[PDB]
Amino acid sequence: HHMSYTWTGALITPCAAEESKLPINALSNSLLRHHNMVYATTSRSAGLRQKKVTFDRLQVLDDHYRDVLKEMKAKASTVKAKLLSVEEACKLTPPHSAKSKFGYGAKDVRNLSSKAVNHIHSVWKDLLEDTVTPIDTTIMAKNEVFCVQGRKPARLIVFPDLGVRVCEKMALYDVVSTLPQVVMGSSYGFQYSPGQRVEFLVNTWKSKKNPMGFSYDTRCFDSTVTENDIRVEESIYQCCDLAPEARQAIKSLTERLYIGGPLTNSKGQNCGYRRCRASGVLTTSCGNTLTCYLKASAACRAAKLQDCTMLVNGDDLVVICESAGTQEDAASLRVFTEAMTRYSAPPGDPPQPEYDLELITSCSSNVSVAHDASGKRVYYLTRDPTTPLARAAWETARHTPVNSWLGNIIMYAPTLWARMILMTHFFSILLAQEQLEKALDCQIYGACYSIEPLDLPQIIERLHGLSAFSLHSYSPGEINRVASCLRKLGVPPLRVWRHRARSVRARLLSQGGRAATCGKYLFNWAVKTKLKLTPISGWFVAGYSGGDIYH
Numbered sequence: 001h002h003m004s005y006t007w008t009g010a011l012i013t014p015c016a017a018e019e020s021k022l023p024i025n026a027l028s029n030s031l032l033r034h035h036n037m038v039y040a041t042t043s044r045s046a047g048l049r050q051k052k053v054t055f056d057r058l059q060v061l062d063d064h065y066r067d068v069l070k071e072m073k074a075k076a077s078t079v080k081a082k083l084l085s086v087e088e089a090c091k092l093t094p095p096h097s098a099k100s101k102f103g104y105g106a107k108d109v110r111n112l113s114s115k116a117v118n119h120i121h122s123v124w125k126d127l128l129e130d131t132v133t134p135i136d137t138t139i140m141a142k143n144e145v146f147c148v149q150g151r152k153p154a155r156l157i158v159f160p161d162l163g164v165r166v167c168e169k170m171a172l173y174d175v176v177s178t179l180p181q182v183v184m185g186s187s188y189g190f191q192y193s194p195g196q197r198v199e200f201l202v203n204t205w206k207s208k209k210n211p212m213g214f215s216y217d218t219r220c221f222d223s224t225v226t227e228n229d230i231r232v233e234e235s236i237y238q239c240c241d242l243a244p245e246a247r248q249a250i251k252s253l254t255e256r257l258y259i260g261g262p263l264t265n266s267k268g269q270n271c272g273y274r275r276c277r278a279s280g281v282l283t284t285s286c287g288n289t290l291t292c293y294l295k296a297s298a299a300c301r302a303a304k305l306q307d308c309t310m311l312v313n314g315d316d317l318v319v320i321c322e323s324a325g326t327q328e329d330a331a332s333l334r335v336f337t338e339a340m341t342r343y344s345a346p347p348g349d350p351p352q353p354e355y356d357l358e359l360i361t362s363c364s365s366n367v368s369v370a371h372d373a374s375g376k377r378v379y380y381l382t383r384d385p386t387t388p389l390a391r392a393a394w395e396t397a398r399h400t401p402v403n404s405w406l407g408n409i410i411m412y413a414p415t416l417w418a419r420m421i422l423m424t425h426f427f428s429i430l431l432a433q434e435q436l437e438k439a440l441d442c443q444i445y446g447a448c449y450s451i452e453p454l455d456l457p458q459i460i461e462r463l464h465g466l467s468a469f470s471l472h473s474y475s476p477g478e479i480n481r482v483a484s485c486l487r488k489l490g491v492p493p494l495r496v497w498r499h500r501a502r503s504v505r506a507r508l509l510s511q512g513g514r515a516a517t518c519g520k521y522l523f524n525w526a527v528k529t530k531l532k533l534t535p536i537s538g539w540f541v542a543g544y545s546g547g548d549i550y551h
């Protein structure tokens with residue numbers, strides 16, 4: 001057996017009671033009426049998740065796999081990475097990151113408290129001196145909001161102690177920030193803003209005489225990741241030009257933490273043991289991207305896919321290539337999938353060839369088209385708004401550590417649903433509470449940012465361009481998917497939201513300075529006669545999911 005996990009039978013436990021039911025307040029019904037459709041995951045379903053993630057991995061590595069790996073290593077040898085000082089790593093820690101078991105917290109770390117710093121120094125020395133003892137991790141059930149499909153079990157998060165997390169940053173922050181783009185070039189997804197990611201997909205689709213594309217979804221990717229895969233990742237990091245002390249900390253973190261280790265619940269009991277990827281380590285995003293790109297690149301070769309271009313964001317993969325005709329394309333995908341499977345990345349849903357760029361979903365998103373003020377066609381990234389709307393509903397009535405509505409407006413600003421619903425609804429709330437000035441935390445590509453809502457128009461201009469404040473004539477397909485999600489969740493129809501936005505718009509103007517700018521730029525779509533809109537950040541460098549990174 002090469003089992004992903006082994007279990008003692010101790011339960012995965014909560015550390016703060018959990019709500020599964022959508023909380024309701026005086027604002028809820030204005031956004032969403034079918035309250036019973038929205039739920040949060042809790043520890044109560046941890047047992048179901050444990051079954052889905054617990055399986056035997058077999059791997060067969062052929063010449064295609066080793067050929068790609070050697071090329072990846074040749075690129076990695078051009079990378080030079082530096083160690084971060086204690087201070088620099090401390091400043092990357094989120095103010096609300098889980099406190100250490102060793103008598104200090106995240107604010108202690110960020111303040112360079114001598115207790116915190118002395119302890120981090122001691123963890124670092126222990127990594128230099130010991131490269132064998134498994135390091136403790138905590139396993140928790142995540143509380144995430146979804147719409148019924150009817151329920152998903154809680155996903156599991158596994159993370160080491162704060163002092164270890166700081167040490168991870170010291171050894172590897174520079175490496176995981178710089179190495180993936182050097183190794184993968186334009187295939188590394190986390191270097192693009194949503195605008196850049198649309199342009200790379202459109203330009204890639206166009207670069208083909210006869211385009212064919214597909215997303216590839218690996219079933220529980222983290223669980224498919226073997227000890228071979230994690231040591232092979234380490235062998236890639238070790239190609240970089242690194243201080244000897246960083247070489248030794250990386251080796252040590254790989255043997256004692258990345259490859260596996262014991263799982264402790266929130267109550268201090270032993271839950272079992274992990275031999276696969278931990279979700280809550282610095283390297284999760286870079287490790288998964290390298291491993292997915294290596295297997296997928298080797299699988300493309302096996303399948304003889306012609307002129308493929310891949311786009312990789314951790315475990316999310318899309319491939320666009322030169323079509324060999326429909327029958328040949330479909331056979332090719334079967335071979336690609338057989339190869340991914342021998343490599344221990346079996347499919348969740350069989351992949352399917354697509355000849356319409358707009359019908360491919362990757363990173364939960366698809367390209368679509370609207371028209372700018374001039375009336376030119378404009379590509380932009382959108383998504384099904386069901387999950388964004390369910391989570392906005394939760395957030396309307398409860399403070400949560402991440403405001404998904406804010407990350408969503410930023411990332412999907414050009415979209416019909418973020419503009420009409422999310423902007424209108426949350427600006428209305430913030431105005432009534434006089435909180436436009438209040439910085440709020442959100443997550444982009446796994447990193448935490450503290451963003452003042454009043455800064456949105458500058459942020460959105462910077463990332464999307466001015467056209468985001470004037471898109472119109474959305475596609476019937478996009479319009480229809482939005483309207484159908486509104487009906488499903490009991491959200492008022494778009495015509496109601498345009499009326500509310502005129503009010504929100506007027507109220508924002510009633511204030512001047514940054515507030516009027518929000519009114520003027522964010523809600524220009526809502527007036528009959530538009531105003532002239534004229535012009536009024538290491539954000540997309542790398543992904544950091546589970547990496548405890550604050551920017």
Ligand SMILES: CC(C)CCn1c(=O)c(C2=NS(=O)(=O)c3cc(NS(C)(=O)=O)ccc3N2)c(O)n2ccnc12
Nearest residue numbers: 194285288313314315316363365411444445446543545
């Ligand atoms: C270009 C955007 C609009 C796509 C959608 N999108 C994401 O893909 C990520 C993103 N955030 S993410 O860094 O947590 C992540 C992780 C992984 N896989 S793993 C665990 O690293 O192996 C795959 C994809 C993602 N995508 C994100 O933070 N946000 C925010 C708003 N929209 C997005």
